[PDB]
Nucleic acid binder design. Structure first.
Lengths: 35, 225, 166, 403, 339, 91, 132, 114
RNA sequence: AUGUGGAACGGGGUAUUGUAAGCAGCUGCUGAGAUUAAGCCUUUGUUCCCAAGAUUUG
RNA sequence: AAUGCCGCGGAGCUAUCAUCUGCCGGAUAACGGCUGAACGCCUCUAAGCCAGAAUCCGUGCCAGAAAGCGACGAUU
RNA sequence: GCCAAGCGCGACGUUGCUUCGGCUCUUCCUAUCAUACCGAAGCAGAAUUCGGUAAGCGU
RNA sequence: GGAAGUCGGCAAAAUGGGAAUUCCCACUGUCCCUAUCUACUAUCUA
């Protein structure tokens, strides 16, 4: 199986990031940030 | 009769338990297996997405009928309470402090008559009689003490080893006051209890069970109509 | 499936939508592909392409020509045949059957070695029956005894190939 | 034979290129003259032996992959002989085996000759001579490679018929509707064309009837195709389903079809014969009926009627020749979780909550957890339904004791 | 030998693990911090429900060893502006708060007792008399500098440590325009930033520090220990509050108790301020300063995304073979002692 | 066998392809600038790429075709894919 | 094999003689090889509960002996830590004679059955009497 | 989540702590520490070991029983339906039992000393 | 370089071992006693110590 | 009683005999193409441009130039 | 031998039967066994065969 | 776990034993796979 530098895997990792996955992370930062 | 499979395992009896008033399925695995049971019994009896002792072998670890259910002493308290919430009130749940925790493997019980392990404890038998409200017979199936695994027992039909003699077959059927058939499941899998689960109106067999075996269990169980 | 099952699906479903144009494009650009190959490739695979392309050119040139015509230690290290035997004659190097070509007939027939007539390298080598180039040896010709001169190097070639003295 | 599994057989040039490329890429290719004579001889010997092993392994794999015609079943052997000239195939296999023996013998002689290598040039000449002799032998056995490749492709594409199981042979006049009946009965859809003997090779279709598996094998109309049909019907435990064109729309008269059936009766002997009257809706027949074995079943080819009845009759003929009450709920007498889980997070990414599937009276109670253990004591294992009144009665008893 | 990515094989030049990379600055996100400084007290083990879909132990209890680091709030005493140059980042200027506590001032002296305590005296004087110079420097930071890093020091006095020097460090202020960071730093001068503002118990952070020195050891021999490491993907299981007595107590356990094991942490003492509980081990022995930073890259793995619901936190005496979480129930089980 | 579902976003500059060969991966392609993607109702399963740059339009078609590629399967028997049918002008 | 198996402490290396727990008549199982062993230099392959290894029947019927054929360990002497945190160790190193498919050749077993072995092998759990 | 009782010391065994040992009779021995586990290994009798609860029970050094608040705890093999008020009352009941059990823990020691 | 300062002890917490000497008729005082930082925790306990020598530094 | 013998034994050390953690961007090769001359057609190539390998270079991690550097604090 | 573009030879083709020896270790090479990606083949699928890029990582 | 170490039960523990160098049984840090302790050495000082 391919490693972590697999170009296709890095493409798929971006697709996770470009959805709610990175999102959930942004406002989760915003909560503690406005605290 | 329906062909069902847990992941890639055809021994649905091991990974799930079936009764005439409730259904038991494993926890944390493939949701398809739970959905298969739900499609056939969801609107009839409750289905419990539970595990015993942190195990997926609840089918062969638990023994019970439509009135009551027994779990080994190794069952965790959190699992015991979770069963009570999911199961309806008219279904008693009881722990068994037994030297043989594989209650499903050692006791083959229907709603009315139960065949237990020859070495089952007297206290366990008393608890079975109290909770299951069934007549307890201490015998063996085909010379093998694991009656709960080598015999698939239902209200209107029973299945045992194909190696049992005719007179042993007739004696067991007379004692169990039920028609009984000596056969195999899952294309030669002689452990019928592990590869077959049947209630009083429906049966579930492994995905590898042959059509001839499927026709046989339907005929003996008279569930066609 | 049975017999020609892709053909049946080709008959019943069809060929690839752009298979025709892609094969045409591949054929059209094959010229640039071959030229780029001949310059980029290196090593043995280049040399194989060197020899293969030269052969293709020669045959292609002939075919057009015919087309125009139509329009118009003490031992011996050499192969031998069997005190005086002071040196050792190894069995593996020793050889008993001679592949000799007839001159007039132009055929190669494999004959037993009757003996050695004369070895030009050395009369000692002649006595030892050393099989070398220029060594003339007698072989049976009944199935065709007559002498024959060795036209190769048996110790290098692996087979004693000669020409009949006829 | 039908199992295929034979590795592809390349051309003579391709096989030589593969062997030489493997030898060069595997064995070392750097032997300087400064190395000792023993090292030089060993290097040449290893290269010769490696080339010999590669050639021998390829030949042995081809020979083992090629099915044994003699050891095959009589139906398979006859089909192979009719379709691929088993005598030629056996000759080709013998030629390859002879070539493999010759190559091994040449390699052994070259290795023995190289054992007494004197100089690097002599070793290089000997090693080159051995490789060329092996290459010449492989190049000589050229047409055999092409014949073997064609045989392998035909064998791979051949049907995997099972004469041991119950079968229903469909042979008779060409385009007599037997192929259409087989296509309807089984999943296999044999192509039907106006050209005579369109289905040159046999087509087998598995079907289930009364919990029994029947292999409906269609045969070309009765040539090589006809010979294959006769050979298949010669040794095969099956029931014949000869189709006689009642309407004669297939181009053959009823008398001609019955005459062909009577001639083919020698192969149909010791089997259940069916004289299916095809195109019923669209003398010789009396003799066929009077034969006894031939069952007269009418199948309207134009109307596509009677095919199921004929199949059922054929299957039956082949088979002949060979207090514990149920508490059934009223609901039982009268979105799924998998879909819900897939729509929620998918398999392995969604967490199924067991709190929802609970019989707790209050939904808040079901969704709220309880202390498993507190102050070193397990609340779950020591809280009973009667503890509510027990604590109040206990407190009163303690107050009375204190007072 | 081992991995060559660590071949320098030498003692770390620093006692405190230096952050080498900060998360990329984003203007869209409003202003927030990215790092914190704590002190490793010790670890215990806990029981946690495993809400891992697709796992063999889904909806089950697991025992996890969790490191506890005491993190009293840090005091933001200054700000540093960084300008991008063709030769890298350059600290253009630095502005400090008017009042600096004795804890941070001890960091500027090797011998604080013999010193005249002269640090920042004139800076405090110039700050009070004229704030125009401070305003000018702040304008330079928000106009020219592209990166803003706040100077924050730990209140080591609250921790039960004989050390009195405060570990002063820089925290990158990611989020918003450079002016927005400057405003945030100015409003936070002399104030305290609690770790609850930085971390929210549901993110997986990078813990960096110097490993414990193993002495000389015998691929050539040499020093094997006291090295700078950066552990990645460490989840905050719980950010407890020092004031609250329910910090160690979970919801499935009740049993009002404190995170400090009975008898205190071995060689650290008692935790009284805000603490952070991390899954697994952390570099360095107890009572060593540990730096925590936000993960540089967004990894949304299922483990990196799942929530955590604690069940029972062990607080038995790690000294010896502890078998009693609190003295109250220890007295309940044991027959009453003559004491 | 498996219908290919194509979704157009922000007037079609991004094409999302799903249910190709039954695969659960959503293939997202962003077209080159100046290229708009539309689904013509005149012919079923038809995609129209109209734009000003022949480079951008043809490259967009090439990228979409290469994304929907058949791997490890017999192309002789597996005909699945998306292919350009006509190349012409808007008027 | 059904379902992934968690790593647990190894205590049954190769060259080990172990007790055979079923009723097939075999008494001593001799470990010769272990399935799923990587290329670890100078490392003895080892077995644990629920792991399938090549075993030879040292003591028992002459007929089933002389078959280097897979055996599932059902009890392990060495202490191992379950993921719940508790430590377990059995007095005896017990194994069951099994075909490569996953079905026990014998009809019944003797002694307690490790739960990790039971969940991994449904046939073993089916034929198990006491799963502890 | 059950806090078990060690076989030897009869003390509280929590998750992670100690060892669990299963006998061929399927009987389970749980040990709170290595000292108790090794004492089981040499098979010393708990009642004969000076510091065990079993010794302190069957030597007059600890009470035969305490029905404090008429009930303290029990091994309930029959699960009970959840109720917020019931789960509340038992928690108050538990501390009341512990306090009263602590009260008898003191008088009895005064009795033995007297 | 005078402080929630430091050190000696001491008390308590906590751990290890297994009921001490002594007294009485194996039992009780006795899970008492001993050890407990030497790289455990804590200290409103006691006493003492320090508001320096030398060196170098624009 | 050279540490006489035995049991337990903290603390430390230690164990895949115990437990944690092990990352992202582009650029390419083979190869698949786009436009497109040469060569009024054609053409993956000439000028140009995409897709694309565990590859390459970065990121991240480790060191920090003991003759690379910055800001800041105070000043015998 | 037969041809045999050509310059008496004559290429490709064609006929003719036929002491050394091995453990550990360090790196490095690719002339690649596996892993990653492509090309071809009656390659349906699956398992392959052959051929490229490739020494990152194992063996 | 028990000779899987190495050309090999060399050294240890077992007591070493039994039967014909071999086999069986027992035993053990030889090995998997090392870990801990002690004194001396080693180190620095006069």
């Amino acid at each position: 199986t391919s490693g972590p530098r697999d170009n296709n895997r890095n493409k798929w990792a971006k697709k996770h990031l470009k959805k709610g996955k990175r999102a959930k992370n942004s406002n989760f930062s915003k909560f503690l940030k406005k605290k | 009769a329906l062909r069902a499979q847990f992941e890639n395992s055809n021994e649905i009896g091991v990974f799930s338990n079936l009764t005439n008033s409730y259904a038991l399925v494993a926890l944390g695995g493939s949701e398809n297996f739970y959905s298969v049971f739900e499609a056939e019994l969801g609107d009839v009896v409750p289905v419990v997405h539970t595990t015993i002792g942190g195990t997926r072998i609840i089918g062969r670890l638990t023994c019970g009928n439509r009135k009551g259910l027994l779990v080994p002493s190794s069952t965790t308290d959190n699992e015991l309470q979770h069963l009570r919430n999911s199961l309806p009130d008219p279904v008693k749940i009881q722990r068994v402090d037994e030297r043989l925790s594989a209650l499903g493997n050692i006791v083959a019980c229907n709603d009315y008559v139960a065949l237990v392990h020859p070495d089952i404890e007297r206290e366990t038998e008393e608890i079975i009689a109290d909770v299951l409200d069934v007549e307890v017979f201490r015998q063996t199936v085909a010379g093998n003490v694991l009656t709960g695994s080598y015999c698939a027992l239902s209200n209107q039909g029973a299945l045992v080893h194909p190696r049992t003699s005719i007179q042993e077959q007739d004696e067991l059927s007379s004692l169990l006051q039920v028609p009984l058939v000596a056969g195999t499941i899952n294309r030669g899998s002689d452990v019928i209890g592990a590869g077959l689960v049947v209630n009083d109106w429906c049966a579930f067999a492994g995905l590898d069970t042959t059509a001839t075996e499927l026709a046989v269990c339907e005929s003996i169980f008279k569930l066609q109509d | 499936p049975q017999n020609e099952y892709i053909e049946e699906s080709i008959r019943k479903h069809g060929r690839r939508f752009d298979h025709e144009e892609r094969k045409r494009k591949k054929a059209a650009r094959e010229a640039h592909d071959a030229s780029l190959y001949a310059q980029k490739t290196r090593g043995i695979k280049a040399k194989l392409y060197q020899e293969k392309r030269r052969k293709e050119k020669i045959q292609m040139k002939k075919t057009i020509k015919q087309h125009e015509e139509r329009n118009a230690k003490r031992m011996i290290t050499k192969a031998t045949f069997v005190k005086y035997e002071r040196f050792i004659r190894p069995m593996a190097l020793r050889q008993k059957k001679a592949n000799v070509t007839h001159k007039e007939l132009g055929v190669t027939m494999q004959l037993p070695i009757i003996g050695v007539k004369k070895n030009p390298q050395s009369p000692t080598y002649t006595q030892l029956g050393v099989l070398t180039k220029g060594t003339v040896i007698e072989v049976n010709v009944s199935e065709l005894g007559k002498y024959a001169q060795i036209t190769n190097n048996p110790e290098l070639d692996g087979c004693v190939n000669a020409l009949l003295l006829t | 034979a039908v199992f295929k599994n034979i590795t592809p057989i390349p051309d003579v040039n391709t096989f030589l290129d593969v062997v030489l490329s493997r030898t060069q890429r595997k064995t070392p290719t750097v032997i300087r003259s400064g190395f000792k004579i023993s090292r030089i001889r060993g290097f040449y010997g290893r290269k010769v032996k490696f080339t010999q092993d590669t050639i021998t392994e390829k030949l042995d794999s081809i020979l083992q992959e090629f099915p044994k015609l003699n050891d095959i079943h009589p139906f398979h052997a006859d089909l192979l002989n009719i379709l691929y000239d088993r005598d030629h195939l056996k000759i080709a296999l013998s030629q390859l085996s002879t070539a493999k023996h010759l190559v091994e013998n040449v390699a052994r002689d070259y290795i023995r000759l190289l054992k007494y290598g004197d100089s690097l040039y002599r070793c290089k000449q000997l090693k080159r001579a051995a490789l060329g002799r092996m290459a010449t032998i492989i190049k000589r056995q050229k047409s055999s490679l092409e014949f073997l490749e064609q045989v392998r492709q035909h064998l791979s594409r051949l049907p995997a018929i099972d004469p041991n199981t119950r079968t229903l042979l469909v042979c008779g006049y060409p385009n007599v509707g037997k192929s259409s009946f087989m296509n309807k009965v089984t999943r296999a859809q044999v192509d039907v064309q106006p050209y005579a003997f369109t289905t040159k090779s046999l087509f087998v279709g598995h079907f289930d009837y009364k919990y029994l598996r029947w292999q409906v094998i269609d045969t070309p109309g009765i040539n090589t195709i006809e010979m294959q049909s006769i050979t298949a019907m010669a040794h095969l435990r099956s029931a014949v389903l000869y189709f006689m064109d009642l309407s004669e729309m297939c181009g053959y008269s009823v008398a001609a079809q019955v005459k062909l059936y009577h001639s083919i009766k020698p192969l149909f002997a010791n089997k259940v014969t069916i004289l299916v009257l095809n195109k019923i809706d669209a003398e010789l027949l009396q003799t066929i009926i009077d034969d006894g074995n031939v069952k007269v079943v009418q199948t309207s080819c134009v109307q596509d009627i009677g095919v199921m009845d004929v199949r059922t009759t054929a299957c039956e003929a082949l088979l002949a020749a060979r207090a514990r009450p149920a508490c059934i709920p009223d609901s039982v007498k009268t979105i799924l979780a998998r879909d819900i889980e897939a729509a929620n997070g998918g398999a392995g990414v969604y967490n199924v909550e067991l709190r929802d599937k609970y019989i707790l009276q209050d939904p808040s109670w079901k969704y709220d957890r309880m202390p498993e253990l507190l102050d070193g004591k397990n609340v779950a294992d020591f809280v009973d339904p009667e503890i509510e009144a027990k604590l109040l009665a206990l407190d009163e008893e303690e107050e009375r004791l204190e007072r | 030998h081992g991995s060559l990515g660590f071949l320098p094989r030498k003692r770390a030049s620093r006692q405190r693990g230096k952050v080498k990379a900060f998360p990329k600055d984003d203007a869209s996100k409003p202003v927030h911090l990215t790092a914190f400084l704590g002190y490793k007290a010790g670890m215990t083990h806990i029981v946690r429900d495993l809400d891992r879909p697709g796992s063999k132990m889904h909806k089950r209890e697991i025992l996890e060893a969790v490191t506890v680091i005491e993190t009293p709030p840090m005091v933001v005493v200054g700000v540093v502006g960084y300008v991008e140059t063709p030769r890298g980042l350059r600290s253009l200027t630095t502005v400090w708060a008017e009042h600096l506590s004795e804890e941070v001032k001890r960091r500027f002296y090797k011998n604080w007792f013999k010193s005249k305590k002269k640090a920042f005296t004139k800076y405090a004087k110039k700050y009070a008399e004229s704030t125009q110079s401070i305003n000018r420097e702040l304008e330079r930071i928000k106009k020219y500098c592209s990166v803003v890093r706040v100077l924050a020091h730990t209140q080591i006095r609250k921790t039960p440590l004989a050390q009195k020097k405060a570990h002063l460090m820089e925290i990158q202020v990611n989020g918003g325009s450079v002016a927005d960071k400057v405003e945030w730093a100015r409003e936070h001068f002399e104030k305290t930033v609690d770790i609850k503002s930085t971390f929210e118990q549901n993110e997986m952070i990078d813990v960096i520090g110097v490993t414990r020195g193993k002495g000389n050891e015998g691929a050539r021999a040499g020093n094997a220990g006291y090295m700078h490491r950066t552990q990645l993907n460490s989840k905050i299981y719980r950010i407890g509050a020092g004031d609250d007595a329910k910090n160690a107590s979970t919801d499935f356990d009740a049993t009002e108790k404190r995170i400090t094991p009975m008898g205190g942490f071995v060689r650290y003492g008692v935790v009284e301020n805000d603490f952070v509980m991390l899954n697994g081990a952390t570099p360095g022995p107890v009572k060593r300063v540990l730096t925590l930073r936000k993960s540089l890259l967004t990894h949304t793995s299922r483990k990196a995304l799942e929530p955590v619901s604690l069940k029972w936190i062990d607080t038995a005496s790690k000294f010896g073979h502890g078998r009693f979480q609190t003295p109250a129930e220890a007295k309940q089980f044991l027959g009453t002692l003559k004491k | 066998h498996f219908p290919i579902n194509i979704n157009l976003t922000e007037n079609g500059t991004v094409v999302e392809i799903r249910n190709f060969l039954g695969e659960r991966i959503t293939r997202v392609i962003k077209c080159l600038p100046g290229v708009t993607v539309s689904i013509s109702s005149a012919v079923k399963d038809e995609i129209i790429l109209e734009g000003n740059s022949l480079e951008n339009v043809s490259q967009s078609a090439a990228n979409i075709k290469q994304i929907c590629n058949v791997r490890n399967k017999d192309i002789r028997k597996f005909l699945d894919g998306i292919y350009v049918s006509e190349r012409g002008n808007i008027e | 094999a059904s379902g992934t198996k968690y790593r647990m402490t190894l205590g049954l290396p190769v060259q080990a003689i172990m007790n055979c727990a079923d009723n097939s008549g075999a008494k001593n199982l001799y470990i010769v090889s272990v399935f799923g062993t990587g290329a670890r230099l100078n490392r003895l392959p080892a077995a644990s509960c629920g792991d399938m290894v090549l075993a030879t029947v040292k003591k028992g019927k002459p007929d089933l002996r002389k078959k280097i054929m897979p055996a599932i360990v059902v009890r392990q002497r060495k202490a191992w830590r379950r993921k719940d945190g508790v430590y377990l160790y059995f007095e005896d190193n017990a194994g069951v004679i099994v075909n490569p498919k996953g079905e026990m050749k014998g009809s019944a077993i003797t002694g307690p059955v490790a739960k990790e072995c039971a969940d991994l092998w449904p046939r073993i759990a089916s034929n198990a009497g006491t799963v502890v | 989540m059950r806090v078990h009782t060690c076989y030897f010391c009869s003390g509280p065994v929590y998750p992670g702590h100690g060892i669990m040992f299963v006998r061929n009779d399927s009987k389970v021995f749980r040990f709170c520490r290595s000292k108790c586990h090794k004492n089981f290994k040499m098979k010393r009798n708990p009642r004969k070991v000076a510091w065990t609860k079993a010794y302190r029970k069957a030597h007059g050094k600890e009470m035969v029983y305490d029905t404090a608040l008429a009930v303290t705890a029990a091994r309930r093999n029959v699960p009970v339906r959840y109720d917020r008020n019931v789960i509340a009352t038992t928690l108050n009941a538990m501390k009341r039992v512990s306090q009263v059990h602590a009260k008898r823990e003191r008088l009895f020691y005064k009795k033995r000393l007297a």
